[PDB]
């Protein structure tokens, strides 16, 4: 079965869509699609994602389908039979949530991996760079993957970085250190 | 958008603030999608015509139990936010009125003369807002008053076996309070509110009928919950009668509460829990079951100085359903309750009637909630009849006894026959105080046990007839003096020979 | 208009019936589906929302298609009743089973009374 399997259900949807259209090889087409209808939805914010909550009926809900398939056209088809499934199953407020799993998927299988520097405040760009660098020349990035390497801004976590990618972390913090010399001095 | 055009047709259109949209129902609870306005405990108006008030709300389904039946009740109803926690009329009206648990007069004595309203929780008088139980509260039982004695403010639970005239032990007390009652000052009355749940149409007929009959329902007030209205409306029921007690209470007047039964009080919060879907604990109520009867209970009390003196006091009645005395809702109430009076079938079928089993009869408050007299008289009465019990187990195991023993046992014969004493029959203190002092001086011990009921009748006869004064006395001052006592030694030695 | 449904579920005798329109039969309503048995009698108990509701069926569930026709009675199974039931044996759902041919009854009342 197609590499990386997301546990849980709305994961469950996403994995089903992900092979689906991995075995219909039309990935960029869906995801593109998926983008799209996931912006329209954004881009609908009242009145149409603020009436995602349950309540509409399977009757109400087709109708939903079908100002969904309205906004555009140029939704992929299988994403269509899937807009159908999540009406009949009666659940869209997890739609969103399955479009970014099924991206979750989807960028899995270009290869392209999401890192995180979460420190205190935001750091050099000679750091972000240097960083990028090194985990791609580590075997960390075993390359055929890609690295968004996202610093964050933790201000609960003082100084220091934690390094993330591919649930490996190296963590070089000044709290994480405080935590575990605090401990030491109270022996 | 044509589509965002048609999102805002197929838009509820509601902010489901003061409203919201039943989505499924049956089993007597619905569930209701909106309601972002509800308030917990709040009475909820279904469009049907039903108010339910609401117990459970969730994170996006409101949980509204049904006071009405759910035929009227169609799922996709609006029902709309009373905005009221539950409440009910309470005034002094409710003298000479059974009423359900809406407060609606179902006896059909017209409307309710209201003075106020009050809700269905109310916070119990605490450590500081009560004073100590002085006054004494009487229900005309010999074995009541004697062995376990009730107090104004005090929770006594009557406990035993399913209808072994299980309601007859309370309306008893009920009947005593005529005496009181037909007098004056209110401070020495207590107004009595039976409330009977769970019970069926006819029952309660049968109890408004008896008591219109002792014309009592000059003094009493009847909250009904019959056994076919909805099991929230019995939930809701001891906690609403607690309201009309508190009134009663507030005002500074003495009043009394018999909750009969809570047993089915438990049965009620079972199915409501159940069907709300909350974890069920053991024996299939859940953990607050324990809250539930404590939180009733203590509601009772006797206001201090500062706050009147106004004594609400309580008489819980469980219903055991096998004499066990580990079921959980037994064990329950007994924590809570300060003293049990423990029935027994087979004292019923002994003839004791009032069948209290004076062993597991206790008052943990004790003494100083009965009269003066009475504690002298009834002084080594209990450690008598305790010795007669210990004495019976081995004069059947039929080990020789000697006369010591069947001192013991003579007496003791008398004392069991003394107990006894017919339904719907009060006796006044003055009268009790005699028969207790001439049992416990020995003078009943002589004569023949068959004809002990007999001289009683008599005896009492005999002390109208010739020491009325000494019984005036003993009613004045209610505490029996050097002169009292030997007045009464004088009077039971004249009629000792009957 | 006959108020249609289907049946979502046959499990046990607790049917389970979808009606297809926005009206909905209210609870202890009573429906007939029709089958080579003559008809099955069944009591709208809960709506279990989305117009399922989830019926007691009153009489024997065998051989039935998930997916069949229902049609509603409207309103709880209403027994024949007079001074004319005296002699007669009359059915769960109401029916001369004593076959001293159809109860001659002036008035039907429903099963269910406050």
Request: glycine share 10%; proline share 4%.
């Given at each position: ?53 349950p309540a ?132 | ?19 919201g949209r039943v989505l499924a129902v049956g089993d007597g609870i619905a569930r209701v999608f909106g309601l972002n306005?509800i308030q917990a405990e709040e009475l909820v108006e279904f469009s049907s015509g039903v108010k339910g008030m609401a117990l459970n709300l969730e994170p996006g389904q409101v949980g509204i139990v049904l006071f009405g039946s759910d035929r009227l009740v169609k799922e996709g109803e609006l029902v709309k936010r009373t905005?009221?926690i539950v ?13 359900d648990a809406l ?17 269905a929780q ?75 749940v769970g019970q069926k ?23 009904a919950a019959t056994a076919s209205e909805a099991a929230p409306l019995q939930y809701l029921a001891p906690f609403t009668a ?19 039964d809570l047993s089915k009080q438990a049965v009620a919060y079972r199915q409501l829990s159940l069907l709300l879907r909350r974890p069920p604990g053991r024996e299939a109520y859940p953990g607050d079951v324990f809250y539930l009867h404590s939180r009733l ?24 359903q ?5 079921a959980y809702i037994?064990?329950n ?166 | ?7 979502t579920a046959?499990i046990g005798a607790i049917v389970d019936v979808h009606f297809?329109?926005?009206?909905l039969p209210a609870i202890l309503n009573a429906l ?10 069944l009591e709208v108990a809960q709506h279990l929302g989305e117009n399922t509701v989830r019926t007691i069926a009153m ?17 709880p ?34 099963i269910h009374a406050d």
């Amino acid at each position: 079965p197609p590499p990386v399997r997301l546990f849980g259900v709305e994961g469950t949807y996403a994995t089903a869509l992900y092979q689906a259209a991995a075995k219909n090889s039309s990935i960029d087409a869906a995801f593109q699609s998926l983008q799209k209808v996931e912006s329209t939805v954004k881009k609908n914010p009242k009145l149409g994602h603020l009436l995602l909550n349950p309540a509409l009926s399977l009757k109400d809900r087709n109708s939903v389908i079908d100002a969904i398939v309205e906004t555009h056209k140029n939704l992929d088809g299988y994403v269509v039979n899937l807009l159908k499934v999540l009406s009949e199953n009666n659940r869209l407020g997890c739609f969103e949530k399955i479009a970014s799993d099924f991206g979750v998927l989807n960028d899995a299988h270009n290869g392209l991996l999401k890192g995180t520097v979460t420190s205190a405040e935001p750091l050099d760009p000679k750091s972000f760079k240097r960083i990028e660098k090194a985990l791609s020349a580590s075997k960390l990035v075993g390359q055929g993957k890609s690295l968004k390497l996202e610093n964050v801004v933790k201000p609960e976590i003082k100084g220091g970085l934690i390094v993330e990618l591919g649930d490996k972390t190296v963590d070089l913090s000044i709290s994480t250190k405080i935590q575990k010399l605090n401990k030491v001095l109270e022996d | 958008s044509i589509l965002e055009e048609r999102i805002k047709g197929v838009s509820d259109e509601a902010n489901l603030n003061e409203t919201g949209r039943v989505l499924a129902v049956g089993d007597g609870i619905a569930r209701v999608f909106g309601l972002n306005n509800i308030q917990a405990e709040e009475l909820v108006e279904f469009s049907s015509g039903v108010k339910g008030m609401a117990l459970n709300l969730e994170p996006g389904q409101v949980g509204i139990v049904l006071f009405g039946s759910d035929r009227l009740v169609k799922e996709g109803e609006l029902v709309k936010r009373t905005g009221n926690i539950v409440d009910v009329p309470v005034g002094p009206g409710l003298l000479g009125r059974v009423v359900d648990a809406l407060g609606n007069p179902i006896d059909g004595k017209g409307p309710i003369d209201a003075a106020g309203r009050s809700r269905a929780q109310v916070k119990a008088p605490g450590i500081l807002p009560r004073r100590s139980v002085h006054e004494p509260v009487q229900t005309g039982l010999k074995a009541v008053d004697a062995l376990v004695p009730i107090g104004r403010g005090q929770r006594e639970l009557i406990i035993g076996d399913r209808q072994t005239g299980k309601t007859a032990v309370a309306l008893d007390t009920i009947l005593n309070q005529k005496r009181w009652n037909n007098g004056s000052d209110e401070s020495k009355k207590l107004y009595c509110v039976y409330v009977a749940v769970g019970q069926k149409r006819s029952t309660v007929a049968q109890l408004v009928q008896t008591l219109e009959q002792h014309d009592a329902m000059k003094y009493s007030i009847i909250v009904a919950a019959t056994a076919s209205e909805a099991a929230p409306l019995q939930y809701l029921a001891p906690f609403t009668a607690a309201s009309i007690g508190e009134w009663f209470r507030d005002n500074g007047k003495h009043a009394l509460i018999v909750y009969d039964d809570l047993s089915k009080q438990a049965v009620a919060y079972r199915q409501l829990s159940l069907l709300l879907r909350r974890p069920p604990g053991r024996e299939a109520y859940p953990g607050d079951v324990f809250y539930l009867h404590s939180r009733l209970l203590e509601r009772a009390a006797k206001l201090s100085e500062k706050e009147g003196s106004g004594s609400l006091t309580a008489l819980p009645v469980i219903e055991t359903q096998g004499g066990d005395v580990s079921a959980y809702i037994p064990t329950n109430v007994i924590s809570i309750t300060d003293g049990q009076i423990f029935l027994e079938a087979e004292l019923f079928y002994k003839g004791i009637r009032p069948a209290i089993n004076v062993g597991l009869s206790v008052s943990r408050v004790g003494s100083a909630a009965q009269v003066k007299a009475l504690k002298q008289v009834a002084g080594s009465l209990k450690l008598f009849l305790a010795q007669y019990r210990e004495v019976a187990a081995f004069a059947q195991f039929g080990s020789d006894l000697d006369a010591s023993t069947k001192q013991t046992l003579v007496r003791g014969e008398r004392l069991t026959q003394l107990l006894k004493q017919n339904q719907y029959s009060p006796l006044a203190t003055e009268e009790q105080v005699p028969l207790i002092y001439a049992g416990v001086n020995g003078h009943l011990d002589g004569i023949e046990l068959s004809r002990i009921g007999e001289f009683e009748s008599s005896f009492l006869s005999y002390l109208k007839s010739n020491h009325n004064e000494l019984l005036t006395e003993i009613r004045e001052k209610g505490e029996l003096s050097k002169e009292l006592l030997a007045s009464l030694k004088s009077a039971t030695e004249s009629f000792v020979a009957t | 208009t006959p108020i249609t449904g289907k049946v979502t579920a046959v499990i046990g005798a607790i049917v389970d019936v979808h009606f297809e329109q926005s009206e909905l039969p209210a609870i202890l309503n009573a429906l007939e589906i029709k089958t080579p048995q003559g008809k099955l009698v069944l009591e709208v108990a809960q709506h279990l929302g989305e117009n399922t509701v989830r019926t007691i069926a009153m009489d024997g569930t065998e051989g039935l298609v998930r997916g069949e026709k229902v049609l509603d009675t409207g309103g709880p199974i209403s027994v024949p009743v007079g001074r004319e039931t005296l002699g007669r044996i009359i059915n769960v759902i109401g029916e001369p089973i004593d076959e001293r041919g159809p109860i001659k009854s002036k008035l039907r009342k429903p099963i269910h009374a406050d």
